[PDB]
Ligand binder design. Structure first.
Ligand SMILES: N[C@@H](CCC(=O)O)C(=O)O
Length: 258
């Protein structure tokens, strides 16, 4: 009996969410989304069975300053609590040092989610003031970007977020959106997710362009034999246009003027 691979992931629309149904759903059947469709394709292409498990601490993954320990999906892979991480997991150098990533299946960049009708046009507009608050998902790649950046504007922004951790860093992208809707707050979030949000909530918009550039990749414990096999599978899916169709399927946001 070939054991099923344990796949860690995280709730994040439209990548992974609880499928609605009139009757209860169990195990893998509970989930749907872009990353779920991606996982399904990987399993058939490589030929493996799996069991989906939501990351226990509900985090993507960041390293602690004192003990140097990681958390989130990154940590679950490091400790071999999961064979693969199939989620909107940003491929970053600091993460590549502890886990491996497949080639990216989607590209993106950090940008700003805010309301319409304001003169704000860039991160610089946010950095020079403190009336409009701003933050990012705690223990995620965006937070880490600002935490280590030496770029003047971003260093200042991290100084702002750091002293206000408990009030501006959020538990999820969903909460970040809620902050934008319930206070004078601008949220630093990935462009792909901003695209999804703004096509569904016409009160919101992206401010400025992409602050950086990265991709999402499937994560595996360092040294895993599946990493290269998954990379090939992703390139195949890309070539035949399936990744494109999958994006269109889940980002279906025929709403909000642009
Ligand atoms: N996708 C990000 C989480 C969200 C964010 O940091 O903006 C990550 O892999 O950590």
């Amino acid at each position: 009996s070939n054991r099923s691979l344990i796949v860690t992931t995280i709730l994040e629309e439209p990548y992974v969410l609880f499928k609605k149904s009139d009757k209860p759903l169990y195990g893998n059947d509970r989930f749907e989304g872009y990353c779920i469709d991606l996982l399904r394709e990987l399993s058939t292409i490589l030929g493996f069975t799996y069991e989906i498990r939501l990351v226990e601490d509900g985090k993507y993954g960041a390293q602690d300053d004192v003990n140097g320990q990681w958390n989130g999906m990154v940590r679950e892979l490091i400790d071999h609590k999961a064979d693969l991480a199939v989620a909107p997991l940003a491929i970053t150098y600091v993460r590549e040092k502890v886990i491996d990533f497949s080639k990216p299946f989607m590209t993106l960049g950090i940008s700003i989610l805010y309301r319409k009708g304001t003169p704000i046009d860039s991160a610089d507009d946010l950095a020079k003031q403190t009336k409009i608050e701003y933050g990012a998902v705690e223990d995620g790649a965006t937070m880490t970007f600002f935490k280590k950046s030496k770029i003047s504007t971003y260093d200042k922004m991290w100084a702002f977020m750091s002293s206000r951790r408990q009030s501006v860093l959020v538990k999820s992208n969903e909460e970040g959106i809620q902050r934008v809707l319930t206070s004078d707050y601008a949220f630093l979030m990935e462009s792909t997710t901003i695209e999804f949000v703004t096509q569904r909530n016409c009160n919101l918009t992206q401010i400025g362009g992409l602050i950086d550039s990265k991709g999402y990749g499937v994560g595996t414990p360092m040294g895993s034999p599946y990493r290269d096999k998954i990379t090939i599978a992703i390139l195949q899916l890309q070539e035949e246009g399936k990744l494109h169709m999958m994006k269109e399927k889940w980002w279906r946001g025929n709403g909000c003027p642009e």
